[PDB]
Enzyme design. Structure first.
Site, short mmCIF file in Angstrom:
data_model
loop_
_atom_site.label_atom_id
_atom_site.label_comp_id
_atom_site.label_asym_id
_atom_site.label_seq_id
_atom_site.Cartn_x
_atom_site.Cartn_y
_atom_site.Cartn_z
CE1 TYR A 1 -4.26 0.99 -0.26
CE2 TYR A 1 -4.41 -1.25 0.57
CZ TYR A 1 -4.99 -0.16 -0.06
OH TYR A 1 -6.29 -0.25 -0.50
CD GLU B 1 -4.25 5.16 0.33
OE1 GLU B 1 -5.28 4.60 -0.09
OE2 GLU B 1 -4.20 5.77 1.42
CG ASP C 1 -7.83 11.16 -24.19
OD1 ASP C 1 -6.86 10.38 -24.31
OD2 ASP C 1 -8.94 10.81 -23.72
CB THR D 1 -4.35 4.44 -22.47
OG1 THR D 1 -4.06 4.55 -23.85
CG2 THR D 1 -5.83 4.70 -22.27
CE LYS E 1 -7.38 2.73 -25.88
NZ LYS E 1 -7.87 4.04 -25.53
NE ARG F 1 -6.36 -3.92 -21.12
CZ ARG F 1 -6.84 -3.52 -22.30
NH1 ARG F 1 -7.64 -2.45 -22.37
NH2 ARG F 1 -6.52 -4.18 -23.40
N1 LIG Z 1 -9.27 6.11 9.71
C1 LIG Z 1 -8.61 6.01 8.54
N2 LIG Z 1 -7.39 5.51 8.57
C2 LIG Z 1 -6.65 5.37 7.39
C3 LIG Z 1 -7.20 5.78 6.18
C4 LIG Z 1 -8.55 6.33 6.17
O1 LIG Z 1 -9.11 6.72 5.15
N3 LIG Z 1 -9.21 6.43 7.39
N4 LIG Z 1 -6.38 5.62 4.99
C5 LIG Z 1 -6.91 5.48 3.73
O2 LIG Z 1 -6.33 4.97 2.78
C6 LIG Z 1 -4.89 5.63 5.17
C7 LIG Z 1 -4.34 7.05 5.41
N5 LIG Z 1 -4.66 7.91 4.29
C8 LIG Z 1 -5.02 9.23 4.38
C9 LIG Z 1 -4.63 10.13 3.33
C10 LIG Z 1 -4.97 11.49 3.37
C11 LIG Z 1 -5.70 12.04 4.47
C12 LIG Z 1 -6.04 13.50 4.46
O3 LIG Z 1 -7.08 13.89 5.02
N6 LIG Z 1 -5.18 14.35 3.85
C13 LIG Z 1 -5.34 15.81 3.77
C14 LIG Z 1 -4.66 16.57 4.93
C15 LIG Z 1 -3.26 16.13 5.30
C16 LIG Z 1 -2.55 17.02 6.35
O4 LIG Z 1 -1.91 18.03 5.93
O5 LIG Z 1 -2.66 16.65 7.54
C17 LIG Z 1 -4.80 16.33 2.38
O6 LIG Z 1 -4.23 15.49 1.66
O7 LIG Z 1 -5.01 17.54 2.12
C18 LIG Z 1 -6.10 11.15 5.52
C19 LIG Z 1 -5.76 9.77 5.49
C20 LIG Z 1 -4.52 4.67 6.32
N7 LIG Z 1 -5.40 4.86 7.49
#
Ligand SMILES: Nc1nc2c(c(=O)[nH]1)N(C=O)[C@@H](CNc1ccc(C(=O)N[C@@H](CCC(=O)O)C(=O)O)cc1)CN2
Lengths: 402, 401
Positions: free
Chosen positions: B46, B48, B191, B217, B220, B226
């Site tokens: 994971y 993100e 696009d 994409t 293609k 993909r």
């Molecule tokens: N309770 C809970 N835990 C979780 C998630 C969730 O959605 N809920 N997540 C889901 O995958 C991950 C964390 N991901 C997150 C990503 C962005 C923000 C967010 O609100 N970002 C704002 C402010 C950031 C700041 O400056 O503090 C932003 O990006 O502007 C919160 C959680 C792991 N744990």
């Protein structure tokens, strides 16, 4: 020419996965056969539409693959309808919302710090930008969901859709009650079981299928499948509208190689071994939480009924970000996580979340949890050290990887 | 325990791909190394956030993978910023639209019947969240009319104007489109999903300098896995779109697919890709000529890229009929409306044919006459076993990656 640089990196990630303790609650390790399907030639086919109703020809075989994934999902969860095309758990929720609501409607979901997911109403997420959000949390004393508070909010705000399910709530959900509340205001009940889908499949967590109008999930996480989404419902009429929102609504061509992998994961979940696996996942979580609690760590809600738990590090003077860094330095991967009523922003947080699905896939047993607990405790108090990293590495290496 | 039922189906699909002639313009065959990356353990992570700023620990290696994908994309297309996280082309467009417009705003794009894509305004999320105005082609030229595009723009004051399509056989004048956008204060989004590979090989005008944002994409003509992609020469605008991809519309990125994207960009940076792309276009032009000599009419009289549109009227066939007859013998194409088709859209008077996929299997221009003959015979004589075997053999003589 082979892209040596890239493959050298992939090899580095394999090593990191083998030599560390992956304790991130939303991760797991997929089997070789799941990966074999995902890396298949099925990616070379454009299959817009649905089985027996595609836009392009040459989908006679692909139709049998998607159909197999559909039927297995239905049998596994006892659903009358399913859609296995969502690219992710996020796209699954998006399609569902756009099918039941119009922009401007009221969506009711769990507050983020209390455990709700970003797609449950966050202002920085499409859910909070397109709909009016009303959030429910947990009680400050027990840190559990208070159903009367939920009821009160629903009556007062009259949401069109109420969402149950979370990303960091360590206890069971009373789906029957949430549905009653939804019926009282004429709302749709959507259950997002992404985190606990596998536990539901194994019969170790209440099943939302009979109570919710629609259920969304990921195929990855406790279900231990490929990275993607899934939608289920006992109402095939509602299912048809949702099918239209997935395509041509919000997606284009589906990822048939990934859908082949979903079929495989469902097959694996129907085997008795999956129930034994899931039972161990839970026993590991409870035991590990108890072990950290015995070492002075405060566990949110006091424990857990599922695969994850939260640690409130405030009494330790550590921010979640700091802890995540220290643990990472010695091969123990977790993620900083918001805790109910967190005074800190998501980028810092006041806690860490821990889950056992991944290490349980690697053969870890409850009797080994006291050891994993000691390693975590030392890394947070003594900080990183080469001798600590080496202990983790050997422990991890003593366990196979799928 | 192996899922034999599932794997038996995968084997049949491989067999089907080897034994047929794929002429669907949007298809291609990826290399084994792209598949190796996609089938890797990177799916377990994971990750993100963006490199160096993730919401999970353990991303040290993943960051190097994603940065590599990003840099390679910038070098290949000549861009100042890139985002490699979109799950698909549709998610790429969605994020851009949501970053530049608010629901209710006006979106201008090519009409679906004239060649535009679903995400360019179909009453699709694009047509549900925004007010749409479409532009098409002239019945007399079969080409886009920049004056009609300009009028429409002045009259409807769109916030965003989309260039690019899924079935347009000629070059685009991105500079003209940008002038139009500036005149009404709109953003120009290009696009290039269909012809991205040609752009990467320098065989098609590059939209980077003229568009504010470019989506595509990775599959293609680019012959990758993909997925989606976003590029721009404006890093500031880039930062805004990064926020819309995550946490805006997606959750965890597919890092195994991203690794696969990095590999494809690597392949596209080698001189052999330019050779492959040159042949794609040569095969399309040659195949179009051969069908023309056999009594079919080519819309616009030819093509500048990897696809062309065939007007079946001279032979009294509909696009639906031809699609079936070809499909019955292992040749896959798709029906497509011709400019101002006298037949409804579910039927049509034409088909779309593309050469990227067969070029990848080693077909050369000298072989196009034979492919043309097989297509003609299936349409005139209809399906038969003997014809199916000729197709089968010719296909098997051209290996897959
Ligand atoms: N309770 C809970 N835990 C979780 C998630 C969730 O959605 N809920 N997540 C889901 O995958 C991950 C964390 N991901 C997150 C990503 C962005 C923000 C967010 O609100 N970002 C704002 C402010 C950031 C700041 O400056 O503090 C932003 O990006 O502007 C919160 C959680 C792991 N744990």
């Amino acid at each position: 020419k082979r892209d040596e640089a890239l493959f050298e990196l992939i090899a580095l990630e394999e090593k990191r996965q083998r030599e560390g303790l992956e304790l991130i609650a939303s991760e797991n390790f997929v089997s070789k056969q799941v990966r074999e399907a995902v890396g298949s030639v099925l990616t070379n086919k454009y299959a817009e539409g649905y089985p027996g109703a595609r836009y392009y020809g040459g989908c006679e075989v692909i139709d049998r693959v998607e159909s197999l994934a559909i039927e297995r999902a239905k049998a596994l969860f006892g659903a009358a309808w399913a859609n296995v095309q969502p690219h992710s758990g996020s796209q699954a929720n998006m399609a569902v919302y756009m099918a039941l609501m119009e922009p401007g409607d009221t969506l009711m979901g769990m507050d983020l710090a209390a455990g709700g997911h970003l797609t449950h109403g966050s202002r920085v997420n499409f859910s909070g930008k397109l709909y009016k959000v009303v959030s429910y949390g947990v009680r400050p004393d027990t840190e559990l969901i208070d159903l009367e508070e939920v009821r009160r909010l629903a009556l007062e705000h009259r949401p069109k859709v109420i969402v149950a399910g979370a990303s960091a709530y360590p206890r069971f959900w009373d789906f029957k009650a949430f549905r009653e509340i939804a019926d009282e205001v004429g709302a749709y009940l959507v259950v997002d079981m992404a985190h606990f889908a596998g536990l539901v499949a194994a019969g170790l967590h209440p099943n939302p299928l009979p109570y919710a109008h629609v259920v969304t999930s990921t195929t990855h996480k406790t279900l231990r499948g490929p990275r993607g989404g899934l939608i289920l419902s006992n109402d095939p009429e509602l299912g048809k509208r949702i099918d239209k929102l997935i395509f041509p609504g919000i997606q284009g061509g589906p990822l048939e190689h990934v859908i082949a992998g979903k079929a495989v994961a469902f097959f694996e979940a129907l085997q008795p071994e999956f129930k034994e696996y899931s039972r161990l996942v839970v026993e590991n979580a409870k035991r590990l939480a108890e072990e950290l609690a015995r070492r002075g760590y405060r566990i949110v809600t006091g424990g857990t009924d599922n695969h994850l738990f939260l640690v409130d590090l405030r009494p330790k003077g550590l921010t979640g970000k700091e802890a995540e860094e220290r643990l990472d330095a010695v091969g123990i991967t977790v993620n900083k996580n918001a805790i109910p009523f967190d005074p800190k922003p998501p980028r810092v947080t006041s806690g860490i979340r821990i889950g056992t699905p991944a290490i349980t896939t690697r053969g870890f047993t409850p009797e080994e949890m006291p050891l994993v607990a000691e390693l975590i405790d030392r890394a947070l108090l003594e900080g990183p050290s080469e001798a600590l990293r080496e202990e983790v590495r050997r422990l991890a290496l003593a366990h196979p990887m799928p």
